[PDB]
Write a protein that binds this ligand. Structure first.
Ligand SMILES: C[C@@](O)(CCOP(=O)(O)OP(=O)(O)O)CC(=O)O
Length: 325
């Protein structure tokens, strides 16, 4: 198509091992602390953008279907950022597929915005650095900043739009030895929940006082390829993030009894020499970090209690966002 510029990208979801939770800046999505994550091989979003001078506004088609006017308006504002960045006024048709178990509660924002950013950079030929790609994705969703990268990644909080972005952490191939089990188990949205907590939680300072120590400990753990050291700090970090919500005004939780059951089975696996550690995000699902060599053994412990359909593993991918057909 002569007057038409398109680009399609595939970006993979990532789970935070050290949590992003609370913004310093609501408009530009600058976080109150750094976060560390691992990018999952099995779950991803494919997003294609097609820019046409004769397009009157941006259109979003998701999983084969028109989105409502609310999502339409939201995506148009985001694309304004893109147009501003490219110095054009081209509108786009955006066709995205989420290969993420969203019905099952898995988040799609990270992969969604990371795929969109990359797709736009490819379509418009902006030649953005990974850094600028991460920055553009961050404007859409904080955790999207990390999905530009594979393996371990860290989002550096910074102090403004220029300085807040993620980068990949080389772990000497360690990500290749690791896996994650997902225990599948309206909700307050991540953005809304973290805002209430950051603004009002009586336990939020306590979170702030320990996160840098956690991050450093975890980073040193990764350098050492020390799984136990990594798991213990990340599990504690996770629980601390949920603690902060308990302190909110008024309190709330994302966890339910079943989540706690899942946690018990992880600790059971530890005492029985199957090392693994758990984490939870903005919902009751429990994610179990385990070494690949133990994925199966640990999975079968869970399959004693939970339906087979609700136990889902993914490996950690080494490569970052990719341009596709
Ligand atoms: C619990 C978390 O998963 C929170 C993620 O929240 P979002 O990345 O969805 O927040 P927004 O920036 O408002 O889009 C922890 C994490 O990924 O660091």
């Amino acid at each position: 198509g002569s007057m038409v510029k398109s680009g399609k990208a595939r970006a993979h979801t990532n789970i935070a091992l050290i949590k992003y939770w609370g913004k310093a800046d609501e408009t530009y999505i600058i976080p109150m602390n750094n976060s560390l994550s691992v990018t999952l091989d099995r779950f991803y979003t494919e997003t294609k953008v097609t820019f046409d001078p004769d397009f009157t506004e941006d259109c979003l088609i998701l999983n084969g279907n028109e989105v409502n006017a609310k999502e339409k308006e939201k995506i148009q504002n985001y694309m304004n950022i893109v147009r501003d960045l490219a110095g054009n006024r081209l509108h786009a048709r955006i066709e995205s597929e989420n290969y993420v178990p969203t019905a099952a509660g898995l988040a799609s924002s990270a992969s969604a915005y990371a795929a969109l950013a990359a797709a736009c950079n490819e379509a418009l030929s902006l030649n953005l650095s990974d850094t600028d790609l991460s920055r553009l994705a961050r404007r859409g969703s904080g955790s999207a900043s990390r999905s530009i990268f594979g393996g371990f990644a860290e989002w550096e909080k910074g102090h403004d739009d220029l300085t807040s972005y993620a980068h990949g952490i080389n772990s000497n191939g360690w990500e290749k030895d690791l896996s994650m089990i997902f225990v599948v188990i309206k909700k307050v949205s991540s953005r809304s929940g973290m805002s209430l907590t950051r603004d009002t939680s009586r336990f939020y300072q306590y979170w702030l006082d320990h996160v840098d120590e956690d991050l450093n400990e975890a980073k040193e753990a990764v350098k050492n390829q020390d799984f136990q050291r990594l798991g213990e700090v990340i599990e504690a970090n996770g629980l601390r993030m949920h603690a902060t919500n308990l302190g909110a005004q008024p309190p709330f939780t994302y966890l339910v009894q079943e989540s706690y059951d899942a946690m018990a089975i992880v600790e059971q696996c530890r005492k029985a020499n199957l090392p693994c550690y758990f984490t939870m995000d903005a919902g009751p699902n429990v994610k179990v970090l385990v070494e690949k060599k133990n994925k199966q053994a640990v999975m079968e412990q869970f399959l004693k209690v939970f339906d087979e359909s609700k136990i889902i593993a993914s490996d950690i991918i080494s490569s970052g966002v990719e341009i596709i057909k």
